[PDB]
Amino acid sequence: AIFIFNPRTGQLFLKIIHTSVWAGQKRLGQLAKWKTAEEVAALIRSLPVEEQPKQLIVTRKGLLDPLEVNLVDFPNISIRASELQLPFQAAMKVEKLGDMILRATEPQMVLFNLYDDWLKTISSYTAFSRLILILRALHVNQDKTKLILRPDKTVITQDHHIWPSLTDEDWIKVEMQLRDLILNDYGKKNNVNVASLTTSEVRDIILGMEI
Amino acid sequence: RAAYEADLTAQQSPYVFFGTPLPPLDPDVRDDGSYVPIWKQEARDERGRKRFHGAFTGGWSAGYFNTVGSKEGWTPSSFVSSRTKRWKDDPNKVEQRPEDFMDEEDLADLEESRKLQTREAFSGLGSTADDAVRASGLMGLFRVEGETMGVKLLKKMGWKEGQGIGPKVRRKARLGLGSDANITEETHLFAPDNVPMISFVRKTDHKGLGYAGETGLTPLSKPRGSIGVGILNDTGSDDEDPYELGPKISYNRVIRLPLDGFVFGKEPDPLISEIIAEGKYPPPRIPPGWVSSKKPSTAEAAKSSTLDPRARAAILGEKQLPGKS
Amino acid sequence: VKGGVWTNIEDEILKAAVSKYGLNQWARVSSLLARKTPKQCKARWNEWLDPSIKKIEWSREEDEKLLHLAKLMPTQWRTIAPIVGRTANQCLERYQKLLDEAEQREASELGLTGPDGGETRAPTAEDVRKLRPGEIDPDPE
Amino acid sequence: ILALERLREAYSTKGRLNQSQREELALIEQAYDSPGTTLERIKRFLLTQRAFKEVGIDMNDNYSTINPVYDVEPIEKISDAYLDQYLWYQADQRHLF
Amino acid sequence: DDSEAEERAAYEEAQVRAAMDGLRG
Amino acid sequence: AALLPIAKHRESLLYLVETNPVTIVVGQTGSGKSTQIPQFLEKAGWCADGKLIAVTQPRRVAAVTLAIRVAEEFGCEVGKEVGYSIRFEDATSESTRIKYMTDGLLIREALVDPLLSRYSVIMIDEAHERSISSDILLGLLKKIRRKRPDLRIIISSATLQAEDYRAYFEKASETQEEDSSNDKQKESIASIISIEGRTYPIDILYLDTPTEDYLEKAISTVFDIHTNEPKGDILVFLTGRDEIEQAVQAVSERSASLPPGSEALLPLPLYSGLSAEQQMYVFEEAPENTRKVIFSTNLAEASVTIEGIVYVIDSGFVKLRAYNPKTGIESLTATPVSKASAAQRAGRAGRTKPGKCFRLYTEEAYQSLPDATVPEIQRSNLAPIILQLKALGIDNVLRFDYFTPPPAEQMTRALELLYSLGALDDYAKLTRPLGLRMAELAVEPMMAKTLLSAQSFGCLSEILTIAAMTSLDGTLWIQHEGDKKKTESVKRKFAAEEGDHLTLLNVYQAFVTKGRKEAHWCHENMLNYKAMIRAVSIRAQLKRFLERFGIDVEESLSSPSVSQQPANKAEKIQRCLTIGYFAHAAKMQPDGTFRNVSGTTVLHAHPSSIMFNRKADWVIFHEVLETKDKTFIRDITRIKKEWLLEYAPDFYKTT
Amino acid sequence: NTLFQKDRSTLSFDKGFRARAEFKIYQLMKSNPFWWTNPRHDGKLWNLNAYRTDVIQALGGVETILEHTLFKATGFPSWEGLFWEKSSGFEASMQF
């Protein structure tokens, strides 16, 4: 899966790549990065100029090389390596997402809304922070994040939604519980006290930058 | 006494054929243009007398001699209209602007509030305001530079930010797979990297190289607003807050003999050592048989130089930038 | 800078302003000067520039008076100085000079005085009291 | 730091300083910038200085009694404040009181 | 810093002994 | 000539200039390369076909002195067979064969013959200095040599960085990769020949501990080296004029305390704008029982050479100018010296007899210093450079064969500055000859834009005069420290309240019209003579340049037609100035300092301008420079805010 | 609170401050109304913001107080978002 997420609107382009591309090929990471850059360039060319991105934030530094080859025609689009260890990989740990990723027989574009219906209530910054926190908690513990996100059987995820529908105070409680889980995991891994952490250290742990 | 200052200015500054000559340097004639600090300045009105005239600008009178009128008086201009001469379709629509009802002080304060700043497409001298945006983390990852148009005109002619300038570099890649040289090395044309700028530390002291110096000590910690207590009764700012005592307490959450003072170098400088050394380049062989083949205005040409850069670079083999197509 | 070492020009302007103004008006006298406060001008007058100050080498009887008074009043130099007849700084400097001279005498008949002018000779307190490069005189008056 | 902090509590109040108060603030900021030279100066003053400047005397009026108020030179005030803090701390350590 | 920890601890028993006047006896 | 080692390899390099299209020369300064290599090329028959030998110098006065020395060695007058050409001064003739130019004058004179068929050999001396014009000329010669292989290029890379030049000189073009199909051997286009000079052995002494005051430590070093070591003139490497003044005053005061019967010490300053008397006192030998202490700036490193020098003290610091790309101001700051610069400073000692080196830092401090200086193209205003590059026709400044590329946002500031100054369109192209008229003028482009936007608004000759005064480094007034009120009075003899430019216009009109070109009149008026008659020649040259612009010249100064009112004329001059100088705008604050339109950086009036003590509201300044702590602005001129809102509608907007 | 403040160490070297504050009357002409307490050693010993809330409530409310004033003559739509400037530009100009 190739993930192309829009933080402002919540749009997510999922490019599912099948095993037919990897059949009969050598040095699979090299042409994997090249095919990823080519697919990103093709999706950029398919998108209109008003919907064309202005900045590209890549989770891996190596994508600085092929995308620049694949975006010679677009000098107005910038590519920047992310120093934040963004947990965008942990999007396989959603059951539905991995379900149609593994069941897909062809390489294809799939549209998703990672914010669901948060933009009607909260802004893009709070929705982005909540999504980053959910992804980090899933990378820490998939089952615990599933239990926290669905604490009761009455909380039902919509068919067109990825996360279950919750109220603002319920989302605040879920965010605080996931923050506690992430802080406890970081304290257990790095042998750091949890209750002595300041706001800057907690926010840096949430963002995943190398402290 | 105007003739005395006039011919004194003529004598002191005779050759002023451009601009205005300065008033003469004498104890009798004051220097109006000279800047005399602030703790030496006196408060004077438009007429030069030392008084104030506003209620909120420190005067004991206000208005037109403690009266809200004027010397010229007030006259209500008239207004007549009908079905024939309707007011709305008249050509001379004298509009009711919020400046017929103002005064010269109001207009002066209005232009005082109207400041000057540069446009968004141009950067100004000393503009340092992007550090708060950049040093914010995820907040600064969305706020990008607002396309100062020099960057845009460099963008049109084939430049993308994040990389430097120069001829295109023919290096293959790095894929993040360590330093594997087993790649095919078919060498796409990349873009040159950005060498960083230099920022010299300010040097006012005479402290030498490699000297750390004495470190300092920090001081032992440290419906908005209210009607003021006066700019002269603010004294030492005796008021900070009544409801609790002291400053804001910040909390934790845990709980040959050389010269005197000069040492001898253990190794000599190599760079001065190759001066007298033979170097690392052998001279050319020069076999017998080679022979020298060559046996032993600018202003006028520049005046006749009709070679415009459209045709000057044509013989230079350079590719012109794409224009309006 | 407000302060600094005193010059002869400043001293003579101080004397002229004292002549024209008196001793109970020091703000005017400091206003003739440029780098000195009224208190600094008053201190310079009271410690050096008053010609009721005895400014020659001390007599011997002054030295016994100073030593007896420094014996009966330890470190009360503003009290000793009116009785001796000099200023407090002059009495303190003469007392320290007598102490250092007695130390030099003890070194002389003790045998510590070997090569004259040598670098192994232990210096007196006057050499330590000499200002290092980058040091401020506490009593410029 | 403690001596300079208690010297600032008089005059760190911004505005309307006379010449001696501004000299004191300059001396305190200079001591903050270079602590070692200030400490060496203070210790030299404690070893050597036995004659001091004139102390101004004024009266503070509480409308029932008046009391003397003493004005000491700022450089001597810095030395006295360091000595005061040092003496109080060392007497607390040695149980003098 | 070990010295800083020691003298901040010294502040801590200073405040406790200030609070425990008479109760300690 | 014969004793120099360069002749020992002479014919060898002749073979190189007959075989290799480009040939880099490695040689220490003082081996006689500059004095003999053009003579060797002239004696090799390279000027028999009407060709020329070009010597490009980064330094101007060094170019003049080297041309004079080569003319003296050749037995010919200067300009007859050996000539020179520096900015606004061309002493050459048709019979001249060896010509010593400024490299910037090669950049600017390249708008005559793009192929440079008038010249056959181009040699770049002092290439280790690495000026901007050196790199631009390197790219120009590399691009020219693709079409003209007969043109020969010699590079005097005095350091060990000649391999960088060589590595630059196989990378020819990306277009030649398609034609590289044959299996022919890659011929050596670039060959680096190392002509070795001679230096007497110099002892280098470092410090056990870093110093607290390098000026006072240097003074103590001078007095210890005078008292202990035998007779020898001391040279000391300092940074600024003030440090040299304090040094000479301190050594004079301590030499007054020197014991009688010892050798007296003569302090001697070495600035850039020295008068003739102090310069000839420095260049003249020490008297009997007298030892000289020359406190010198960077000149003695590379520009000038003073004989009989035994001692040299490197302070480890040198002032450098760095144009900030984000703010847009210069910064003359004390940079630590480079390894190559300190090596040259050490090697400048042992010339006549074996001397000693006294670098005032520890030996481990000479381990993390930069190997070479910062590139000059990376710390300069690229707007004249981009202007010159578009004047040559190379508008693809992004894709240009730079020796070292400037960093990616300095030229963005340069292009912003060029767009604000007319010149460029929205498509990054030099326009309809507006941009061409700022292209060829040898003025700062700001007031070149003013001089173009002068004819449409009347007055042209007055700010042509001001253009003569502005393009002028060494100041008009002779700095007389003995006179304080007299200097103010003679500055008030020509004073104008409406700015500082009109004062320069007044002194030019006083010199030219009524002064009858008389120098002693300038001698009572505390003014220089050589630089300002040079400015007269500059005004004549710029009048000629605008004569080639097609605009007729309105010289009404000779006419007595004063019927136009002078107040409107003065505000017309300053109105044209703020038409031009809208970018350099500031407002004076109540505390006496100035501030930019953004209201962020504190600016102060320079203590040479007429408005040092005068009160103004809005001002323009010619140039801004950062000193040790204060940021000064020069040539203060009074303006109005609505002038800024009227003549800069796309730059400035009100709230 | 004093166990958690930032500079507890330099405050641990601060002894004899109460007698010093008693003897401060012979050094400064300005009296200290809080001579008896040191905020860096005792902490904040009172809190009076509930007085502000209850004196707003005692006078009827914000609307009654603003009815006593020229608030409706300013034309400001709501009270919240309205800040006072202490001095003026002219008043701060005429300071020294």
Numbering used by the authors:
A (entry chain A): 1933 to 2143
B (entry chain 1): 7 to 228, 266 to 298, 343 to 383, 395 to 423
C (entry chain L): 4 to 144
D (entry chain A): 967 to 1063
E (entry chain CY): 343 to 367
F (entry chain z): 18 to 672
G (entry chain A): 1547 to 1642
What does the literature reporting this entry say, word for word?
The spliceosome, a multi-megadalton ribonucleoprotein (RNP) complex, catalyzes nuclear pre-mRNA splicing, where introns are removed and exons are ligated together. Here, we provide high-resolution cryo-EM structures of such so far undetected spliceosomal intermediates that contain suboptimal splicing substrates, isolated via the RNA helicase DHX15 from the thermophilic eukaryote Chaetomium thermophilum (C. thermophilum or ct).
One state corresponds to the ILS complex, while the other two complexes represent aberrant spliceosomal assembly states stalled prior to step I catalysis and subjected to quality control. We have thus termed them quality control complexes B*Q1 and B*Q2, as they represent Bact complexes that have been intercepted by quality control while on their way to B*. We would like to emphasize, however, that we were able to track the RNA backbone and thus clearly see that the pre-mRNA bulges out into the active site center between the U5/5’-exon and U6 ACAGA helices. Strikingly, in ctB*Q complexes, DHX35 is bound to the single-stranded BS region of U2 snRNA, comprising nucleotides G32 to A37, within the RNA binding channel of its RecA domains. Moreover, the focus-refined density in state B*Q1 closely matches the expected shape of TFIP11. Since the DHX15–TFIP11–GCFC2 complex is known to associate with ILS spliceosomes primed for disassembly, ctB*Q2 might represent an intermediate nearing disassembly, while ctB*Q1 could represent its precursor.
